[PDB]
Amino acid sequence: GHMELFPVELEKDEDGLGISIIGMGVGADAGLEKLGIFVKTVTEGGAAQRDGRIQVNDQIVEVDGISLVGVTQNFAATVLRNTKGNVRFVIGRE
Known part of the structure; x- marks a missing residue:
C-alpha cells in the first residue's frame, strides 16, 4: 500500500x-523507523470510536500541529491530554 x-x-x-x-x-525495518506512538486505547465511543475515521490500532503522527514524530509516551500522552474537542489528528497509516 x-x-x-x-x-x-x-x-x-x-x-x-x-x-x-x-x-x-x-x-520499521525499512530504515526510517518513525515514531512508535501507537494508539493504545480510545474511549468506549465518545465521538472517536463513534467517528469512524480514527481507530485504536492507528498511530499518532501529529496532533494539533505539535508534530510528535519520535517522542516518548510521556510527550505523546501529554499531547493527547492537552487536546480539546476539535482535534486535528494527522495520523498516517497504510
Whole structure:
C-alpha cells in the first residue's frame, strides 16, 4: 500500500479524548523507523470510536500541529491530554 498521512479533525466532547497511546519504537525495518506512538486505547465511543475515521490500532503522527514524530509516551500522552474537542489528528497509516 502507501502510507497515507491524513488529517482527522475529530469533534470530541468537553472532557477531551479519553484516549491512550503507547510508546513503542517501531522497528520499521525499512530504515526510517518513525515514531512508535501507537494508539493504545480510545474511549468506549465518545465521538472517536463513534467517528469512524480514527481507530485504536492507528498511530499518532501529529496532533494539533505539535508534530510528535519520535517522542516518548510521556510527550505523546501529554499531547493527547492537552487536546480539546476539535482535534486535528494527522495520523498516517497504510
